Every structure is written in C-alpha cells, then in structure tokens.
PDB file of C-alpha atoms and ligand atoms in Angstrom:
ATOM      1  CA  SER A 208     -20.963  17.464 -23.627  1.00 21.28           C
ATOM      2  CA  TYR A 209     -20.034  16.703 -20.001  1.00 22.24           C
ATOM      3  CA  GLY A 210     -19.335  12.974 -20.322  1.00 22.67           C
ATOM      4  CA  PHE A 211     -15.909  13.462 -18.710  1.00 21.02           C
ATOM      5  CA  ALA A 212     -17.054  15.820 -15.941  1.00 20.73           C
ATOM      6  CA  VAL A 213     -14.786  15.282 -12.904  1.00 19.38           C
ATOM      7  CA  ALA A 214     -16.549  15.156  -9.565  1.00 17.36           C
ATOM      8  CA  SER A 215     -13.423  14.980  -7.404  1.00 14.71           C
ATOM      9  CA  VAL A 216      -9.691  14.259  -7.219  1.00 13.07           C
ATOM     10  CA  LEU A 217      -7.396  12.592  -4.689  1.00 13.95           C
ATOM     11  CA  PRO A 218      -5.183  13.785  -3.077  1.00 13.10           C
ATOM     12  CA  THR A 219      -7.495  16.512  -1.788  1.00 10.75           C
ATOM     13  CA  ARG A 220      -6.251  20.082  -1.534  1.00  9.33           C
ATOM     14  CA  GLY A 221      -3.579  20.303   1.123  1.00  7.47           C
ATOM     15  CA  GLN A 222      -3.782  16.599   1.996  1.00  8.35           C
ATOM     16  CA  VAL A 223      -0.609  15.043   3.474  1.00 10.64           C
ATOM     17  CA  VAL A 224       0.209  11.784   1.687  1.00 10.09           C
ATOM     18  CA  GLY A 225       2.901   9.170   1.261  1.00 11.99           C
ATOM     19  CA  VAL A 226       5.381   9.440  -1.547  1.00 12.61           C
ATOM     20  CA  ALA A 227       3.753   7.026  -4.046  1.00 13.03           C
ATOM     21  CA  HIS A 228       0.191   8.295  -3.688  1.00 11.26           C
ATOM     22  CA  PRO A 229      -1.703   7.988  -6.980  1.00 12.11           C
ATOM     23  CA  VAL A 230      -3.806  10.748  -8.484  1.00 14.53           C
ATOM     24  CA  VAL A 231      -7.331   9.314  -8.307  1.00 10.64           C
ATOM     25  CA  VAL A 232      -9.946  10.925 -10.564  1.00  8.99           C
ATOM     26  CA  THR A 233     -13.639  10.214  -9.863  1.00  8.49           C
ATOM     27  CA  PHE A 234     -16.026  11.033 -12.672  1.00 10.47           C
ATOM     28  CA  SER A 235     -19.523  12.426 -12.244  1.00  7.39           C
ATOM     29  CA  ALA A 236     -20.972   9.616 -14.429  1.00  9.87           C
ATOM     30  CA  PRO A 237     -19.642   6.191 -15.438  1.00 11.09           C
ATOM     31  CA  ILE A 238     -17.720   6.020 -18.701  1.00 10.43           C
ATOM     32  CA  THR A 239     -19.033   2.645 -19.785  1.00 10.96           C
ATOM     33  CA  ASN A 240     -17.549   2.767 -23.291  1.00 14.32           C
ATOM     34  CA  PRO A 241     -13.908   1.591 -22.927  1.00 11.96           C
ATOM     35  CA  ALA A 242     -13.170   3.299 -26.247  1.00 11.54           C
ATOM     36  CA  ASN A 243     -14.070   6.683 -24.717  1.00 13.24           C
ATOM     37  CA  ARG A 244     -11.527   6.088 -21.917  1.00 12.54           C
ATOM     38  CA  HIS A 245      -8.579   7.426 -23.927  1.00 12.87           C
ATOM     39  CA  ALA A 246     -10.443  10.689 -24.513  1.00 14.13           C
ATOM     40  CA  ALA A 247     -11.324  10.784 -20.836  1.00 15.95           C
ATOM     41  CA  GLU A 248      -7.663  10.288 -19.886  1.00 16.37           C
ATOM     42  CA  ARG A 249      -6.706  13.207 -22.130  1.00 14.40           C
ATOM     43  CA  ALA A 250      -9.383  15.423 -20.596  1.00 15.55           C
ATOM     44  CA  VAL A 251      -7.975  14.605 -17.126  1.00 10.87           C
ATOM     45  CA  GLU A 252      -4.301  14.951 -18.128  1.00 10.88           C
ATOM     46  CA  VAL A 253      -2.223  14.994 -14.961  1.00 12.05           C
ATOM     47  CA  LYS A 254       0.318  17.832 -14.835  1.00 12.34           C
ATOM     48  CA  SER A 255       2.371  17.992 -11.630  1.00 11.94           C
ATOM     49  CA  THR A 256       5.104  20.275 -10.353  1.00 12.54           C
ATOM     50  CA  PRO A 257       7.681  18.766 -10.182  1.00 12.88           C
ATOM     51  CA  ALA A 258       6.961  17.013 -13.456  1.00  9.81           C
ATOM     52  CA  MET A 259       6.178  13.301 -13.166  1.00 10.00           C
ATOM     53  CA  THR A 260       5.280  10.619 -15.699  1.00  7.88           C
ATOM     54  CA  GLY A 261       2.663   8.018 -14.910  1.00  7.25           C
ATOM     55  CA  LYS A 262       0.129   5.514 -16.178  1.00  9.74           C
ATOM     56  CA  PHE A 263      -3.657   5.499 -16.028  1.00  9.75           C
ATOM     57  CA  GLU A 264      -5.538   2.531 -14.560  1.00  9.31           C
ATOM     58  CA  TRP A 265      -9.322   2.301 -14.455  1.00  7.98           C
ATOM     59  CA  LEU A 266     -10.596   1.124 -11.055  1.00 13.11           C
ATOM     60  CA  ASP A 267     -14.308   1.331 -11.967  1.00 15.25           C
ATOM     61  CA  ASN A 268     -16.417   2.761 -14.772  1.00 13.36           C
ATOM     62  CA  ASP A 269     -16.172   6.158 -13.054  1.00 13.06           C
ATOM     63  CA  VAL A 270     -12.732   6.086 -11.372  1.00 15.39           C
ATOM     64  CA  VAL A 271      -9.338   6.235 -13.073  1.00 14.64           C
ATOM     65  CA  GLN A 272      -6.119   6.455 -11.089  1.00 12.86           C
ATOM     66  CA  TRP A 273      -2.857   7.873 -12.411  1.00  9.34           C
ATOM     67  CA  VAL A 274       0.035   5.894 -10.924  1.00  8.84           C
ATOM     68  CA  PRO A 275       3.286   7.934 -10.829  1.00 10.21           C
ATOM     69  CA  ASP A 276       6.268   6.128 -12.358  1.00 10.68           C
ATOM     70  CA  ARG A 277       8.580   7.354  -9.587  1.00  9.50           C
ATOM     71  CA  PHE A 278       8.179   8.484  -6.008  1.00  7.85           C
ATOM     72  CA  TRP A 279       7.127  12.036  -5.286  1.00  9.63           C
ATOM     73  CA  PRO A 280       9.717  14.083  -3.371  1.00 13.65           C
ATOM     74  CA  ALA A 281       9.284  13.700   0.372  1.00 14.28           C
ATOM     75  CA  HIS A 282       8.475  16.646   2.643  1.00 14.04           C
ATOM     76  CA  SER A 283       7.256  18.702  -0.305  1.00 11.97           C
ATOM     77  CA  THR A 284       4.345  20.611  -1.751  1.00 13.06           C
ATOM     78  CA  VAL A 285       3.365  18.998  -5.071  1.00 12.57           C
ATOM     79  CA  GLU A 286       1.364  21.206  -7.389  1.00 12.98           C
ATOM     80  CA  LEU A 287      -1.226  19.293  -9.373  1.00 14.41           C
ATOM     81  CA  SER A 288      -3.370  20.105 -12.394  1.00 11.01           C
ATOM     82  CA  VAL A 289      -6.009  17.614 -13.530  1.00 10.14           C
ATOM     83  CA  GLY A 290      -7.524  19.070 -16.699  1.00 10.07           C
ATOM     84  CA  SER A 291      -7.684  22.762 -15.701  1.00  9.80           C
ATOM     85  CA  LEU A 292      -8.623  21.946 -12.081  1.00 12.38           C
ATOM     86  CA  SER A 293      -5.633  23.367 -10.198  1.00 12.68           C
ATOM     87  CA  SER A 294      -4.780  21.795  -6.865  1.00 11.82           C
ATOM     88  CA  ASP A 295      -1.891  20.940  -4.593  1.00 11.71           C
ATOM     89  CA  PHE A 296      -0.997  18.466  -1.893  1.00 13.02           C
ATOM     90  CA  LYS A 297       1.864  17.745   0.520  1.00 10.67           C
ATOM     91  CA  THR A 298       4.091  14.710   1.002  1.00  9.91           C
ATOM     92  CA  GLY A 299       5.418  13.540   4.343  1.00  7.70           C
ATOM     93  CA  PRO A 300       8.553  11.459   4.839  1.00  4.98           C
ATOM     94  CA  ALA A 301       9.410   8.765   2.315  1.00  5.02           C
ATOM     95  CA  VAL A 302       8.504   5.672   4.341  1.00  5.21           C
ATOM     96  CA  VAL A 303       9.442   2.669   2.211  1.00  6.56           C
ATOM     97  CA  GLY A 304       8.953  -0.991   3.111  1.00  8.81           C
ATOM     98  CA  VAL A 305      10.655  -3.755   1.137  1.00  9.28           C
ATOM     99  CA  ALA A 306       9.627  -7.364   1.746  1.00  9.25           C
ATOM    100  CA  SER A 307      12.101 -10.050   0.662  1.00  9.11           C
ATOM    101  CA  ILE A 308      10.476 -13.450   0.209  1.00 10.93           C
ATOM    102  CA  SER A 309      13.829 -15.274   0.199  1.00 11.43           C
ATOM    103  CA  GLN A 310      15.417 -13.404   3.118  1.00 14.95           C
ATOM    104  CA  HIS A 311      12.143 -13.512   5.132  1.00 15.63           C
ATOM    105  CA  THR A 312      12.626  -9.851   6.051  1.00 12.77           C
ATOM    106  CA  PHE A 313      10.748  -6.553   5.842  1.00 14.32           C
ATOM    107  CA  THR A 314      13.127  -3.579   5.576  1.00 12.73           C
ATOM    108  CA  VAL A 315      11.786  -0.140   6.519  1.00 13.50           C
ATOM    109  CA  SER A 316      13.579   3.073   5.576  1.00 13.47           C
ATOM    110  CA  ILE A 317      12.560   6.639   6.407  1.00 14.39           C
ATOM    111  CA  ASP A 318      13.828   9.209   3.880  1.00 15.43           C
ATOM    112  CA  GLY A 319      16.447   6.669   2.800  1.00 11.42           C
ATOM    113  CA  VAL A 320      17.641   5.787   6.312  1.00 11.93           C
ATOM    114  CA  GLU A 321      16.837   2.285   7.549  1.00  8.12           C
ATOM    115  CA  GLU A 322      15.218   2.436  11.002  1.00  6.07           C
ATOM    116  CA  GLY A 323      13.132   0.279  13.327  1.00  8.08           C
ATOM    117  CA  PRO A 324      11.754   0.402  16.888  1.00  9.61           C
ATOM    118  CA  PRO A 325      14.055   0.469  19.940  1.00  9.91           C
ATOM    119  CA  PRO A 326      14.434  -3.264  20.652  1.00  8.27           C
ATOM    120  CA  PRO A 327      13.426  -4.397  24.184  1.00  6.45           C
ATOM    121  CA  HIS A 328      15.553 -12.639  24.256  1.00  6.85           C
ATOM    122  CA  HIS A 329      13.950 -15.667  22.583  1.00  6.15           C
ATOM    123  CA  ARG A 330      13.022 -14.446  19.076  1.00  6.84           C
ATOM    124  CA  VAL A 331      14.923 -13.672  15.876  1.00  9.46           C
ATOM    125  CA  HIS A 332      16.178 -10.156  15.429  1.00  6.72           C
ATOM    126  CA  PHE A 333      18.890  -8.744  13.184  1.00  9.84           C
ATOM    127  CA  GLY A 334      21.492  -6.284  14.379  1.00 11.98           C
ATOM    128  CA  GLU A 335      20.695  -4.148  11.344  1.00 12.69           C
ATOM    129  CA  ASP A 336      18.492  -1.067  11.711  1.00 13.75           C
ATOM    130  CA  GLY A 337      15.166  -1.253   9.911  1.00 13.65           C
ATOM    131  CA  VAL A 338      15.416  -4.947   8.980  1.00 14.47           C
ATOM    132  CA  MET A 339      12.429  -6.712  10.539  1.00 12.48           C
ATOM    133  CA  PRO A 340      11.854 -10.466  10.750  1.00 10.62           C
ATOM    134  CA  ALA A 341       8.931 -11.245   8.456  1.00  7.54           C
ATOM    135  CA  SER A 342       6.900 -14.194   7.175  1.00  6.45           C
ATOM    136  CA  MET A 343       5.462 -13.977   3.656  1.00  8.48           C
ATOM    137  CA  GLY A 344       2.944 -16.206   1.900  1.00  9.44           C
ATOM    138  CA  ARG A 345       3.496 -19.950   1.789  1.00 11.19           C
ATOM    139  CA  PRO A 346       3.850 -21.620  -1.640  1.00 10.85           C
ATOM    140  CA  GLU A 347       0.127 -22.416  -1.696  1.00  9.46           C
ATOM    141  CA  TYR A 348      -0.790 -18.735  -1.160  1.00  9.59           C
ATOM    142  CA  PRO A 349       2.364 -16.779  -2.014  1.00  9.40           C
ATOM    143  CA  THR A 350       2.884 -13.067  -1.567  1.00 10.53           C
ATOM    144  CA  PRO A 351       2.962 -11.681  -5.139  1.00  9.86           C
ATOM    145  CA  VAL A 352       6.023  -9.740  -6.262  1.00 10.63           C
ATOM    146  CA  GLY A 353       5.363  -6.159  -7.284  1.00 10.05           C
ATOM    147  CA  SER A 354       5.297  -2.481  -6.394  1.00  8.24           C
ATOM    148  CA  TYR A 355       2.414  -1.600  -4.054  1.00  6.11           C
ATOM    149  CA  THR A 356       1.205   1.444  -2.163  1.00  8.50           C
ATOM    150  CA  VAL A 357      -0.464   1.691   1.227  1.00 10.07           C
ATOM    151  CA  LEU A 358      -4.194   1.907   0.564  1.00 10.85           C
ATOM    152  CA  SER A 359      -5.470   2.163   4.142  1.00  9.68           C
ATOM    153  CA  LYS A 360      -4.486   1.700   7.792  1.00  7.15           C
ATOM    154  CA  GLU A 361      -6.806   0.065  10.335  1.00  7.14           C
ATOM    155  CA  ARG A 362      -6.748  -1.050  13.962  1.00  5.77           C
ATOM    156  CA  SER A 363      -8.388  -4.235  15.245  1.00  9.30           C
ATOM    157  CA  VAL A 364      -9.852  -5.171  11.896  1.00 12.14           C
ATOM    158  CA  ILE A 365     -11.268  -8.675  11.502  1.00 14.50           C
ATOM    159  CA  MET A 366      -9.855 -10.703   8.605  1.00 13.94           C
ATOM    160  CA  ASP A 367     -11.557 -13.886   7.342  1.00 13.83           C
ATOM    161  CA  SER A 368     -10.176 -16.684   5.198  1.00 14.31           C
ATOM    162  CA  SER A 369     -12.696 -15.728   2.480  1.00 13.77           C
ATOM    163  CA  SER A 370     -10.198 -13.150   1.142  1.00 11.89           C
ATOM    164  CA  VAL A 371      -7.966 -15.900  -0.293  1.00 11.88           C
ATOM    165  CA  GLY A 372     -10.798 -18.309  -1.137  1.00 14.15           C
ATOM    166  CA  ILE A 373     -11.601 -20.418   1.929  1.00 14.46           C
ATOM    167  CA  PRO A 374     -14.824 -20.423   4.001  1.00 12.60           C
ATOM    168  CA  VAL A 375     -14.334 -19.650   7.672  1.00 13.41           C
ATOM    169  CA  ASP A 376     -15.466 -23.114   8.858  1.00 18.68           C
ATOM    170  CA  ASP A 377     -13.226 -24.885   6.273  1.00 21.27           C
ATOM    171  CA  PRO A 378     -10.325 -27.252   7.161  1.00 18.91           C
ATOM    172  CA  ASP A 379      -7.882 -24.334   6.840  1.00 18.56           C
ATOM    173  CA  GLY A 380     -10.128 -21.347   7.396  1.00 18.17           C
ATOM    174  CA  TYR A 381      -9.497 -18.537   9.861  1.00 18.20           C
ATOM    175  CA  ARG A 382     -11.093 -15.484  11.435  1.00 17.48           C
ATOM    176  CA  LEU A 383      -8.471 -13.200  12.972  1.00 18.38           C
ATOM    177  CA  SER A 384      -8.586  -9.947  14.891  1.00 17.66           C
ATOM    178  CA  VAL A 385      -5.548  -8.107  13.572  1.00 17.28           C
ATOM    179  CA  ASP A 386      -4.103  -5.321  15.655  1.00 19.31           C
ATOM    180  CA  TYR A 387      -2.201  -3.248  13.072  1.00 22.05           C
ATOM    181  CA  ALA A 388      -3.297  -3.628   9.456  1.00 25.07           C
ATOM    182  CA  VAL A 389      -1.606  -1.792   6.591  1.00 24.97           C
ATOM    183  CA  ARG A 390      -3.589  -2.623   3.439  1.00 24.39           C
ATOM    184  CA  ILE A 391      -1.593  -2.748   0.202  1.00 27.73           C
ATOM    185  CA  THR A 392      -4.042  -4.274  -2.326  1.00 26.97           C
ATOM    186  CA  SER A 393      -7.750  -3.837  -2.931  1.00 25.10           C
ATOM    187  CA  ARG A 394      -7.858  -7.652  -3.023  1.00 24.50           C
ATOM    188  CA  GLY A 395      -6.855  -7.824   0.648  1.00 27.29           C
ATOM    189  CA  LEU A 396      -3.084  -8.026   0.984  1.00 29.30           C
ATOM    190  CA  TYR A 397      -1.784  -6.502   4.223  1.00 28.99           C
ATOM    191  CA  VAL A 398       1.339  -5.846   6.216  1.00 29.36           C
ATOM    192  CA  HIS A 399       0.164  -6.678   9.705  1.00 31.32           C
ATOM    193  CA  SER A 400       0.919  -7.860  13.220  1.00 29.68           C
ATOM    194  CA  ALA A 401       0.924 -11.663  13.509  1.00 31.94           C
ATOM    195  CA  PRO A 402       1.789 -12.638  17.102  1.00 31.44           C
ATOM    196  CA  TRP A 403       0.524 -16.201  16.595  1.00 30.86           C
ATOM    197  CA  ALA A 404       3.080 -16.432  13.755  1.00 34.82           C
ATOM    198  CA  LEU A 405       6.041 -15.390  15.931  1.00 35.51           C
ATOM    199  CA  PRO A 406       8.073 -18.634  15.444  1.00 34.86           C
ATOM    200  CA  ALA A 407       8.232 -18.321  11.649  1.00 32.28           C
ATOM    201  CA  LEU A 408       9.263 -14.647  11.595  1.00 31.52           C
ATOM    202  CA  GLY A 409      12.571 -14.212   9.796  1.00 33.48           C
ATOM    203  CA  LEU A 410      12.676 -17.950   9.026  1.00 34.80           C
ATOM    204  CA  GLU A 411       9.630 -19.397   7.210  1.00 32.95           C
ATOM    205  CA  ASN A 412       6.998 -17.988   4.833  1.00 34.19           C
ATOM    206  CA  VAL A 413       3.884 -19.419   6.488  1.00 32.82           C
ATOM    207  CA  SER A 414       1.227 -16.761   5.865  1.00 31.81           C
ATOM    208  CA  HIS A 415      -1.431 -16.942   3.142  1.00 27.68           C
ATOM    209  CA  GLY A 416      -0.102 -13.982   1.176  1.00 25.83           C
ATOM    210  CA  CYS A 417       0.088 -11.253   3.788  1.00 25.33           C
ATOM    211  CA  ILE A 418       3.312  -9.781   5.149  1.00 28.91           C
ATOM    212  CA  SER A 419       3.463 -10.876   8.795  1.00 30.07           C
ATOM    213  CA  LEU A 420       5.387  -8.933  11.438  1.00 29.26           C
ATOM    214  CA  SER A 421       5.742  -9.061  15.182  1.00 29.21           C
ATOM    215  CA  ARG A 422       3.294  -6.807  16.991  1.00 27.55           C
ATOM    216  CA  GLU A 423       6.106  -4.464  18.014  1.00 25.14           C
ATOM    217  CA  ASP A 424       7.531  -4.131  14.501  1.00 28.67           C
ATOM    218  CA  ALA A 425       4.067  -3.852  12.934  1.00 28.25           C
ATOM    219  CA  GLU A 426       3.095  -1.146  15.439  1.00 30.85           C
ATOM    220  CA  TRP A 427       6.234   0.835  14.592  1.00 32.81           C
ATOM    221  CA  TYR A 428       5.829   0.558  10.818  1.00 34.77           C
ATOM    222  CA  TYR A 429       2.094   1.257  11.099  1.00 34.89           C
ATOM    223  CA  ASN A 430       2.739   4.416  13.102  1.00 33.89           C
ATOM    224  CA  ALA A 431       5.461   5.512  10.663  1.00 36.98           C
ATOM    225  CA  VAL A 432       3.752   4.853   7.330  1.00 40.58           C
ATOM    226  CA  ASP A 433       1.114   6.946   5.549  1.00 40.36           C
ATOM    227  CA  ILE A 434      -1.495   6.109   2.937  1.00 40.74           C
ATOM    228  CA  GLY A 435       0.286   6.446  -0.418  1.00 39.49           C
ATOM    229  CA  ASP A 436       3.707   5.255   0.779  1.00 41.00           C
ATOM    230  CA  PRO A 437       5.311   2.494  -1.323  1.00 40.74           C
ATOM    231  CA  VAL A 438       5.666  -1.159  -0.403  1.00 41.00           C
ATOM    232  CA  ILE A 439       7.874  -3.390  -2.563  1.00 45.04           C
ATOM    233  CA  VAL A 440       7.718  -7.193  -2.572  1.00 47.50           C
ATOM    234  CA  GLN A 441      10.805  -8.921  -3.987  1.00 46.23           C
ATOM    235  CA  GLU A 442      11.923 -12.533  -4.231  1.00 49.70           C
TER     236      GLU A 442
HETATM  237 CA1   CA B 603      -2.066  10.918   4.969  1.00 49.23          CA
END
C-alpha cells in the first residue's frame, strides 16, 4: 500500500527560503479520492524544529502544501520531518511587504526594520523609511485582502490582460513587459514595477489587482525579497 508515497518535498534540503515558505509535498501518484486526503495528510504529518502549527491545502490531486500559521524564524536552520523523511532548510532575513489599499502604500521591513532604497523631485515620496508609494487594484479589479507569500521572481516577464479576464485586443486589454515581477498568487497577482503608472503611485489605486511600484522601489524590494517571504494586503 503505497498510495501516499511521497516523491519530493519543498523546501529542498539546505534550501534558503523566505520566512513564510510553505512545506509542499508532491505525491508519487494522484490521490483522486478526497476522502483519502485526511489519511494522506496524517501520513505526511509536518514536524518542524522549532515547532510550528499549520494547515494543509491541496494544490492538485498529487500536491498538498502545509501553510505555517506563523512566520519561521529568520536567519535560522529549520529542521523538518515529513512522515519519517528527515530534512532541513534555512531561512534568510524576514522580508515583509505590507500593502495598504487605503493609504496607497507598500511598506517593506527587513527583520522588523523598515527600509527602502537610497532616494535619488517631481514624484510622491514619504520621509519614512520603507514606506513606498503604491497603486493597488481599482474598484473594478481590486487587490484582494489577505496573507500571501512570494511564489516566484521574474525579470522582463510579459503580462497579458487575459489574467484578469480581458482579451488583449479588447477595449481595456493590455500586454506589458514588466521589469521586476514578484508573483504572490498562482492566479497572477504580482508586486511589480509600473513606470507608466507613476502618477497614481501613493495617490490612486488604478491597477487591475496588482501592487504597482516605481521601478526603483520595485527593483529594491525585488532584490531584497525571497521566494517564501510574506506579503500582506490590508484595507
Ligand atoms: Ca530562496
């Protein structure tokens, strides 16, 4: 009986990850019976050192992720057992981004200390370290509130309007080349550089869901953040 045979686990052994990185378990064969999922979860019981509570979420018939309830300790070695498989990984700095829809800001802290790039005359900027002018999703396509984690980081990725439900050649379609792209949902939500959107930054929520930053702020956050680091969206 190898129905719950585990092919692999993320983080990999010795991987360096951000401080909300889930434990992602990939099974050797799909578990197509949702009733067998609770037994599968028990067979892949996640035991970390330091101890952490979490919640299982199935991403596919053969992938379940265990989402920690709290952040891992930064700059640490986390020991990890996933049903007998003994592993470990490392965390880097706690790089946390908090988007405020009402304040039109994106606040970046590193290990608790708010910080941003060294500012180099005609654009909004706050005198407060780490607080970046941002533009969230407009009321038609709002940025959803929640607790996210960085799923991937890409340079010069092309984003279409088909991600929010609009063909490219449609009245309000788009096809953008985006310089710095920090992906925070599998659906296609990003923190990213939006130079065309410079006037709205810090003032208006004019994007279609994504968290828009200046190129300089996006570049700094992109270079600071790691896959697994948390991103909070608040009203
Ligand atoms: Ca990493």
